[PDB]
Design a protein around this ligand. Structure first.
Ligand SMILES: *[C@@H]1O[C@H](CO[C@H]2O[C@@H](C)[C@@H](O)[C@@H](O)[C@@H]2O)[C@@H](O[C@@H]2O[C@H](CO)[C@@H](O)[C@H](O)[C@H]2NC(C)=O)[C@H](O)[C@H]1NC(C)=O
Ligand SMILES: *[C@@H]1O[C@H](CO[C@H]2O[C@@H](C)[C@@H](O)[C@@H](O)[C@@H]2O)[C@@H](O[C@@H]2O[C@H](CO)[C@@H](O)[C@H](O)[C@H]2NC(C)=O)[C@H](O)[C@H]1NC(C)=O
Ligand SMILES: *[C@@H]1O[C@H](CO[C@H]2O[C@@H](C)[C@@H](O)[C@@H](O)[C@@H]2O)[C@@H](O[C@@H]2O[C@H](CO)[C@@H](O)[C@H](O)[C@H]2NC(C)=O)[C@H](O)[C@H]1NC(C)=O
Ligand SMILES: [K+]
Ligand SMILES: [K+]
Ligand SMILES: [K+]
Ligand code: NA
Lengths: 382, 382, 382
């Protein structure tokens, strides 16, 4: 007969047994403080609420640096091309009757920015509530709720600035801001594209294609190339106003993740705060079920839009069944979650996730509780 | 003087005459159940609420299968090319002083997945409410409300995973999941692009372009082609981690539509449930207006991002005017809606819609009531 | 000790001291009216609320007209090409032993539509509230709240139809509707792309690239070109159902901005209206701080996805500190905002914005109050 469920984050209330409601639209980039002494219609309760500015957390794959460069054309006339040491090149031989060779190569290379592929975007605010001698702080994700015996704080919002798959480019001492690219080259990079010339890891260029053709023109042959000769950096700069900038504040780069506070004050979210002074709220997720967790296996990749899957062994006691969520987390960041009705005893639960880095150990978690160890996922782009 | 309007789905309440509020953030992929006996401060009322998991419904155009293949180059030397039977080919003749022909053709073709263009995305939850001997179930769209005399259930949420225009690729026995492509080729498909080699309907390939050039190189000429030789499937697989996967559960494919439950447990929506035990809510859309409906004509297409327009003849009685919505629906799925202030008597109302398939008969509907017949739209991509 | 903050738009209420709540999901394209006489459990208060249809305001850059055309190939044999007057052309000379010239040129040019790049998208509803002899109307942005002593109206919603960076194409007497393009050419335009042939300002074509190659074939040489010969307009029309249409009503074009009401009746937003008859709401943004404003400088561009930055000199009196927002606005439209904790006396505040046109004078604003003059930003695409 029981059907315990902790996936509901919120409260049941009797509107006549509630004492205070705060309901408002708040600038995303602003904090908010509320302080009041709650008195009886000779004992007072101190209420102190602090809501911090909206933070964005983006799980990314670092793509390395984008480069500007010049495309050079050379003519030579077995026996190797004069330009052979160039990493990025294209050639055609005209031979017989040794050869007579046309070559293209990139040179005057210079890094212009660092690029990051968006894997996941999540917004949150840190919320702290003191009610009497109770003090509790929690990072509340947008579209989730802070729940306590006497106070509920729900945040509801939407933002459409960034999308999964976008590429963020930072031109310099990041902070300040960057550009969003919606069409950074991936499966085909041709010279001229945004993202054309990349160095994924300081060494090794991923060279673009040169889709055009050579031609040979009473003396010496002269080579011509009839494709595009303008680098992607130059083409983008020539129409820079076509691209979308964003600004940042208090940036924090870590491996495969960027967090910051977006200072765009045009954005708002909705905050609702409900307080009951006497009779406790009915916590909708209250239950007597107890969960033990450990990892079993993992497959897939960090830093990947495809992602990974963490297999968890989950033990349920004190309930016949329990509808809940099992998460894949490491160091207080969660990368995926699976809603599941557990049955009493052992359960096997697969959790699909995305994000993290080579050093991540993805743990099986329930609420704030996690397994003793996590598992590493595989590298992407092998 | 009257200005009846049923476009407001919700209630007016006196907060002191309300008995229970449930307010919470719920895991999108989780159900929720609430059961309580409502008692007087010796007669009890059974309250039973069942909210089902979020479902996504996507109106799509089935694009057929994407293929891998190999690009082959041949040299021949009136009188037809040795490779002439290949559906996808490209040739250049070098003649005079019969010809001497260079050819490219695709072969070793193999279907790798089924592709679907997103036309419309809608999320919903089925909500069932028992209050006493009243029992009512309704599919509630995200950002709409369930309304009854004693209970309101509103769902508010946002999801940004899928966008109109995205292409979904399913690699195998769909269920499990798929990939999202944001740049599947449409107006120009070149060999190497995602979507390059398609078969829209099991027969007939839509062949990609081959943008490169041929060249002819003491004996026989040998042809060369200087464009890309790697298929789009291979190029995408080589950088697969650049693309975004999604997972699915309890899939249901129908013609030009896919429905499933997304098991991503990181997503949440907001649920508000308000209950009045005694005095009925004021239903904000209550009215005495009566509507009769029939179709008049249709133009445009199913399976199209451009869409169709259904013209409806709508009769209004019992009101001088009525602000309401007229919808284009078939088999309990609605594909478009027009808000309109009807005037007493006959009205002509045009409803713009998107989606459906060749067998769809788009009917004129108001609320749960529809015309006796619907009209077929035209096919896309003719 | 004080920490005044006006970034919270909303109210604190005691639920037992509130008299009426309206909560509902409203068709985006519908208005809503509520009229009631508020009576004591012999004096009545007239309540009259009018909510107007959702309006979209899009800051854009007008891209000029897109053209259809025909690609013509000519052979000629110092001394200028027969086709030299064509604005869009491509040539290769085959010379020595004067030249023998192959040329391509565009002709039969015809404008097919007007294109606009989306810079910013904002939705709003006009809300008017009469409570007794108080009457107040305000344009309320989605996810903001109307706040007065006796009535709060909050709008919460999300729409995903348009994105920053999309290109809107209007084919004719705009109104009716248009097409959305997610991949309009920017940094590289090749013949065949959406956006290939543009005229930014009635004179001057921005010509596309012709990435293919010429070749020369007992008499006269004949030129061939092996690249794409089909215009972008024709290629798009050939697969028009792949693109997304939208409809419009009561359009209003101004320089670099378009406003309209989207008649898509499938879209809804959420409206909450709370009324207290007797004791005034606690306005969460109430404060005694007083602000003076003037511009100091500006940099950056109108009509640009990169944007501008307006530097404001802001004087704070009557408070030691004040957390608020300073905006960049002109003629009752705001283009950016910065949340800031001002300190008593002078402050320098930088406000990042996007949008506007050459005639815009961006002013420093707080609430409904603005500086006496604004500053012009620079043109984009110079
Ligand atoms: C959720 O999806 C993952 C992802 O794997 C799928 O990705 C799709 C894009 C598509 O390519 C499909 O063919 C592919 O299976 C599933 O994980 C995969 O499962 C298969 C079969 O068990 C394994 O062979 C893969 O190694 C494995 N990959 C990863 C990264 O885990 C997963 O099964 C699916 N369901 C759940 C509950 O996570
Ligand atoms: C809503 O838009 C449709 C779509 O038709 C428009 O699509 C735009 C993308 C653009 O190309 C524009 O030129 C085009 O008209 C309108 O329907 C069309 O209306 C015209 C004129 O009556 C007819 O000739 C078309 O056949 C018709 N097409 C379809 C599919 O119905 C429609 O009028 C407009 N308004 C409403 C209220 O639906
Ligand atoms: C908010 O961002 C703007 C935009 O300028 C940045 O844009 C990024 C896309 C990237 O290219 C980065 O290199 C670039 O600085 C900042 O404005 C710029 O600031 C610099 C340094 O002071 C000036 O040299 C530029 O002229 C100026 N441009 C504009 C349009 O204002 C701005 O500083 C930043 N911060 C704030 C608070 O607005
Ligand atoms: K080439
Ligand atoms: K070609
Ligand atoms: K060329
Ligand atoms: Na070529």
């Amino acid at each position: 007969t029981p059907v315990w469920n902790d996936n509901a984050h919120g409260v049941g209330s009797v509107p006549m047994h509630t004492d205070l409601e705060l309901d408002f639209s708040l600038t995303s980039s602003s904090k908010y403080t509320y302080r009041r002494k709650l008195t009886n219609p000779a004992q007072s309760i101190d209420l102190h609420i602090e809501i911090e500015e909206q933070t964005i957390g983006v799980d990314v794959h670092a793509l390395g640096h984008w480069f500007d460069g010049r495309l050079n054309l050379k003519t030579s006339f077995k026996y190797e091309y004069p330009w052979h040491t160039a990493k990025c090149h294209y050639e055609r031989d005209y031979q017989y009757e040794g050869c007579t060779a046309c070559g293209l190569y990139l040179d005057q290379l210079k890094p212009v920015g660092s690029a990051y592929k968006i894997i996941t975007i999540r917004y949150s605010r840190r919320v702290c509530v003191q009610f009497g001698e109770e003090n509790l702080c929690k990072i509340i994700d947008m579209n989730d709720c802070f729940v306590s015996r006497h106070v509920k704080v729900c945040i509801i919002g939407t933002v459409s600035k960034f999308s999964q798959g976008d590429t963020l480019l930072f031109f310099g001492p990041l902070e300040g801001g960057g550009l969003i690219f919606k069409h950074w080259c991936t499966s085909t990079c041709q010279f001229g594209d945004p993202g054309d010339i990349m160095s994924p890891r300081d060494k090794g260029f991923l060279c673009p294609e040169f889709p055009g053709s050579f031609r040979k023109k009473a003396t010496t042959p002269i080579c011509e190339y009839d494709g595009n000769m303008v680098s992607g950096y130059k083409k983008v700069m020539a129409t820079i106003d076509s691209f979308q900038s964003f600004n940042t504040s208090t940036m924090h780069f870590t491996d495969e993740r960027i967090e910051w506070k977006d200072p765009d004050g045009m954005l708002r979210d909705h905050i609702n705060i409900l307080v009951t002074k006497d009779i406790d709220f009915d916590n909708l997720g209250e239950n007597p079920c107890k969960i033990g967790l450990q990892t079993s296996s993992i497959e897939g990749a960090w830093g990947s839009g495809v992602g990974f899957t963490l297999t968890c062994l989950v033990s349920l006691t004190e309930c016949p069944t329990f509808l809940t969520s099992i998460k894949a987390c490491d160091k207080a960041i969660c990368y995926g979650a699976e809603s599941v009705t557990l049955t009493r005893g052992q359960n096997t639960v697969k959790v699909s996730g995305k994000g993290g880095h080579s050093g991540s150990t993805f743990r099986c978690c329930h609420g704030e509780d996690c397994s003793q160890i996590g598992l590493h996922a595989a590298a992407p782009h092998l």
